Amino acid sequence: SKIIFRLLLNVLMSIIAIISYQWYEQLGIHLTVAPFSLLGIAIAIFLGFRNSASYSRFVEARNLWGTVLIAERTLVRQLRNILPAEHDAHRRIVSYLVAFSWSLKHQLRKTDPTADLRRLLPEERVTEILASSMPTNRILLLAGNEIGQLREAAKLSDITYGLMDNKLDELAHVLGGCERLATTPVPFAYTLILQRTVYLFCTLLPFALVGDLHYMTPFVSVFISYTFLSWDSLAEELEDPFGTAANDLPLNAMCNTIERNLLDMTGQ
Amino acid sequence: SKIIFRLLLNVLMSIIAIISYQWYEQLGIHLTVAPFSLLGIAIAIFLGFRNSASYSRFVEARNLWGTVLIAERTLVRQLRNILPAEHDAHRRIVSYLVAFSWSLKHQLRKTDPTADLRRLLPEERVTEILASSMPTNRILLLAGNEIGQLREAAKLSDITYGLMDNKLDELAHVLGGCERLATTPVPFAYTLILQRTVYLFCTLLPFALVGDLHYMTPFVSVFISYTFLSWDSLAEELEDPFGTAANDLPLNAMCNTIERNLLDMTGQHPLP
Amino acid sequence: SKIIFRLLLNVLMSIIAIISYQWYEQLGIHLTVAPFSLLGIAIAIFLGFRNSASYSRFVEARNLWGTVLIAERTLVRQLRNILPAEHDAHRRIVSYLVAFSWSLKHQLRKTDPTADLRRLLPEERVTEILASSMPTNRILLLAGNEIGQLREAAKLSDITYGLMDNKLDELAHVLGGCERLATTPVPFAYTLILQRTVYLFCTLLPFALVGDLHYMTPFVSVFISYTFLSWDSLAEELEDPFGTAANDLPLNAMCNTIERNLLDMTGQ
Amino acid sequence: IIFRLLLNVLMSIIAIISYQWYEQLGIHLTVAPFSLLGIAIAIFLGFRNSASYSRFVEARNLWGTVLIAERTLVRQLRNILPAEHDAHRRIVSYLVAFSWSLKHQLRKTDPTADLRRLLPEERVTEILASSMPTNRILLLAGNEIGQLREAAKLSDITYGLMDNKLDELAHVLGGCERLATTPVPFAYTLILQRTVYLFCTLLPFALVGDLHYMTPFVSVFISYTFLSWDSLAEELEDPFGTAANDLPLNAMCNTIERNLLDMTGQHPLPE
Amino acid sequence: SKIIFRLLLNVLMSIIAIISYQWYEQLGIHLTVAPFSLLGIAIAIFLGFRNSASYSRFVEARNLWGTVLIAERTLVRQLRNILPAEHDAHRRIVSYLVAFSWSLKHQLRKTDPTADLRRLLPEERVTEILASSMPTNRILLLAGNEIGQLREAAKLSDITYGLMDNKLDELAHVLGGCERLATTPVPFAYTLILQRTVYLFCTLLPFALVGDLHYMTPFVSVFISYTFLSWDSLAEELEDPFGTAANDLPLNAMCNTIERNLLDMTGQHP
Ligand SMILES: [Cl-]
Ligand SMILES: [Cl-]
Ligand SMILES: [Cl-]
Ligand SMILES: [Cl-]
Ligand SMILES: [Cl-]
Ligand SMILES: [Cl-]
Ligand SMILES: [Cl-]
Ligand SMILES: [Cl-]
Ligand SMILES: [Cl-]
Ligand SMILES: [Cl-]
Ligand SMILES: [Zn+2]
Ligand SMILES: [Zn+2]
Ligand SMILES: [Zn+2]
Ligand SMILES: [Zn+2]
Ligand SMILES: [Zn+2]
Ligand SMILES: [Zn+2]
Ligand SMILES: [Zn+2]
Ligand SMILES: [Zn+2]
Ligand SMILES: [Zn+2]
Ligand SMILES: [Zn+2]
Ligand SMILES: [Zn+2]
Ligand SMILES: [Zn+2]
Ligand SMILES: [Zn+2]
Ligand SMILES: [Zn+2]
Ligand SMILES: [Zn+2]
Ligand SMILES: [Zn+2]
């Protein structure tokens, strides 16, 4: 909460305004409420639309992760339904699917996958994966080798191969989606503009309130600031969905659910 | 709603400002309207967006439930159309599909699936299902085994297997979509912030209103407070569409519909 | 057009405020514009968001019906192009597709589909359909059966069977969508809340306008009221897409269009 | 539009040279009520313009799909049946006829010349006989693909890959039809237009109090804002209406013709 | 983004309003705030909706480019998984997929693709591609011949050919979406209204503010103009996402990422 300092700096800005209202006539400065209404409203409208975009970006992240669990569940389901004997293949594929999740998590958090990957895969595979500048993509390529092998060994027909291939595509879209969200921020200009504007607004506001509210100036002014600043900071918290804040996605729990899910489906 | 408390708790504070308005003088308190116009409009705008976000959650949730019915209807149709004679599988698969929907409702209402499960499937299966930490998924896996067995037995080809396989994917997307709406709400700041704000605004509003309205003050403040608080609680309601409030989804009716659909006439169908 | 009732009731509410404006401050009752601008604005925002939802639900009802035409057109096309010889199957499948439309209309309007079904299908099939607790869904099953026969008789392969099965899936999505829309209104609370506030607001309004407009009160309180009610009433006129009112979907004409189209494509 | 700005100036001058008589009599117009009205209308115009915009965008997407589907079908024909140039040419004909015919259908203009240039007279009579000419064209494109399958030049699989493209065109056809026979509101766009229209005419009277001579200036600026927003919605609401901008629809049908002649090597001219 | 010119011209207009407020009474002109408030809020609402549309277009554009990378990655994945031995095919298709991306960037920027094409493909292919009303389209058709030839040679079945066909189908959709976003400014009613509107409003605002603020006019007037103009020009940037403004897609970087991914997946080293 940087908000609380911003509130107290605003109570102080109001005192400065009461004490200084005297020399207003002298200095030749009069400030009515009316234009601050115009400005405040304008700012609230833009804050509303901005916040809308931030929430949508957070929702997209959530959906992207939702697909991971859906597509992995159904790939394992398919593997069991189509090749119920082939538990060798099941185990290999499930570990790739589980690696994909953790890999994706680490990629977005800008952290080290080595532990999670080493915990899941053989060494001849882990070094291949960490070798690529696109590890997560590499895990998908390898999961693909698995299904292709079962195809070449005639365990899968072209059709059944096709069914599982679609699920890798789904995972591909998730990877791209997340990378896209990670690297493409909501234009910095939104935070640039609005952060400036909101701060300057809350700051100048008591200077305009004072003529009308006098000593009441602090109370009302801090209230209006709390409304604006709270809404503005909610946008901020929603904007980095892949971060570590408690307000961000619990990527760790999500990857756990995924792992436990795929292990449950295989009996582990 | 649960608004009449705070609507009354507000008629009080509105008399206070009719008794106080001459004493503003003495204490040193001026309070025009225009600042409260500004603050009120801002809150309206934010209430607007919040409510819209809440409704989308409602609508998505309704849609995900819609797909359960569609996807189950079409899977049964496919089984009837492609394997018209295989009533044993028809029956097995339908009860899994019916279990699926009830199981999903229990999952989301945080209630016990056992009664509904036992009503539909044999007990060894009820224990396979309850054994899992994700029972709905387990029912899907079991439904899939039914389809896969018909395939291993060469009653389905790969193509016709895949037609049915698609429908199970559709249901997996419902499960996933539903879990996503349930585990994560709209981040808890949303409700914490807005409720504080709307109410704080509502109580102070008359203190600033009197000077203009004089006597008509407590009315025109309760009217405004109704509007703001109405909107805020409806949002709070729709936000949790698997809840049990009046404006949430009728999940029990929806599973009843699904059930009556699949089991329509002791499960009997015209044969091609 | 009960709107012109409320407009008239409004002219009357002006006139009591015009003449009763005297005894106002003696009582101590004042109504300024400013707080009614706050309410008016807040209500307009909520009216906006709401009518939005109303509009979307109506657009969805059109889209769904639109898909009937699209999917039935394309199923008929596929049958002509894949099985040009097989006019018997053509005519059967077409009568089911036409029955489906009419049946869906009857279900949404809660009317008796019997005559239409009897004009299109043999009595036995009608009996099958009407015996079901879900007749329209049963029409899909029968059409599926016709397609299934073609498959058994090897006139269709699995692949081409599949191309046509996809179309019955689309019709399934239409049927579910309509059912969902029919049983899921825009939540009542919206219409409740808003009808209270809009009604009370347009009532209390010439009161809060008279001490500003005096003799221009009626002509301005009514123009404002017509504006809120016009816009509140656009919701009313969009919330019953399946109805028979002038502003509701012309489902009979759309059903004729569907039938006319399928008959054009089979040269009847 | 510019007629209603000239009327606004006229009403503004009336406002000044009449402000005298009427406020003396008991009949007053303040700014605050017309400010609540105007903001409400602005809000409504906002939501209205949102719905309009999204019908405009839907029309662009549908037409976008024609370009995409037609390109990919022809690509599929070349990649899968490289040698069947006669089929390539017939199919491209129908594809191009489909576009032009859709455009004609939406703009309620005559497709005859486009059909006669593109197809044999037998087919043109057949297509013109139908009450659903565009759908009939898709059906004929269908027969082409169908015959290639009958002759065992397409397998059921590869027939299917091409069939999808025809379905995409089916979706476009119906989507556009639905966008055309609209709107959805009924004669309520006439209500909000008149609401804006009346609001802009009463407004100088409500302003003259505060602005006197400045009235016509500030009044016409405001009127302009509302009337512009309103008429932009009118345009957007009706992408296929009788007074629409036909430049991009014509651009699209030309692009696709051009693209397909390119893909089938009917372009460039030979050396 | 010569926005500061518009702001300074606004500070100027403010002084013009102060110095001329003296003559104000004498000339016979009154200008209250309340009517400018009405217009101002209207315009704000309009900028709100407008800006939101612009953002949407930008997000769509970004998404489409997202799909290039996804679809191309997965095409190469299918090629390796299904035809592990056909490394010639691997290389030729990859150079088409890489040519596709750069060619798309060129198309959208209206620049010449000749250099990049020549870097990636034999000259015969370059000539074929350059000869076409739509080079990206021709590139997809060439990629299509590759998998087509593999199908002809019975190295792909109809089904596995189809799986790969779908990916080219996806690229066609991307191509179309980008064409649509690039040739869809809309009717230039977003300049006759929003740009000049906001502009005029901002310069008349001080004339209207001055009776109330006196010397404070330019401070308040600048703050309000900043707010509106910031909002407006950000819309402008977002509206044209394939442009070269600050806030427009780094298409060259996105193309490099694409190329690098595809090179990574097929054994090769940048
Ligand atoms: Cl899936
Ligand atoms: Cl296993
Ligand atoms: Cl389905
Ligand atoms: Cl279709
Ligand atoms: Cl026939
Ligand atoms: Cl026929
Ligand atoms: Cl396509
Ligand atoms: Cl050719
Ligand atoms: Cl050719
Ligand atoms: Cl893909
Ligand atoms: Zn899926
Ligand atoms: Zn296993
Ligand atoms: Zn082993
Ligand atoms: Zn490391
Ligand atoms: Zn489906
Ligand atoms: Zn049965
Ligand atoms: Zn009093
Ligand atoms: Zn379709
Ligand atoms: Zn026939
Ligand atoms: Zn009705
Ligand atoms: Zn496509
Ligand atoms: Zn050719
Ligand atoms: Zn050309
Ligand atoms: Zn004067
Ligand atoms: Zn894809
Ligand atoms: Zn290779």
Numbering used by the authors:
A (entry chain D), C (entry chain A): 22 to 289
B (entry chain B): 22 to 293
D (entry chain E): 24 to 294
E (entry chain C): 22 to 291
How is this structure described in the published paper?
Twelve identical residues shared between KpBest and hBest1 on the loop structures within the channel core transmembrane regions were identified as the subjects of alanine substitution, as we reasoned that replacing conserved residues on the (relatively flexible) loops, rather than substitution on the rigid helices, are more likely to be informative without disrupting the overall channel structure. Alanine substitution mutants for each of the 12 residues were generated in KpBest and hBest1 and subjected to crystallography and patch clamp, respectively. All 12 KpBest mutants were purified with a size exclusion profile indistinguishable from the WT, suggesting that the overall integrity of the channel is still retained after alanine substitution. Eleven of the 12 KpBest mutant structures were solved, while 10 of the 12 hBest1 mutants displayed altered channel function.
Human bestrophin1 (hBest1) is a Ca2+-activated Cl− channel essential for Cl− transport in retinal pigment epithelium (RPE). Overall, the channel is a pentameric assembly with a single ion-conducting pathway, which varies in diameter along its length and is constrained at two narrow points: a “neck” contributed by three residues (I62/I66/F70 in KpBest and I76/F80/F84 in hBest1/cBest1) on a transmembrane helix, and an “aperture” formed by a single residue (I180 in KpBest1, I205 in hBest1, and V205 in cBest1) on a cytosolic helix. Here, by electrophysiological and structural analyses, we show that the neck and aperture in hBest1 are both indispensable Ca2+-dependent gates, and their dysregulated opening by rationally designed or patient-derived mutations causes Ca2+-independent leak and elevates Ca2+-dependent channel activity.
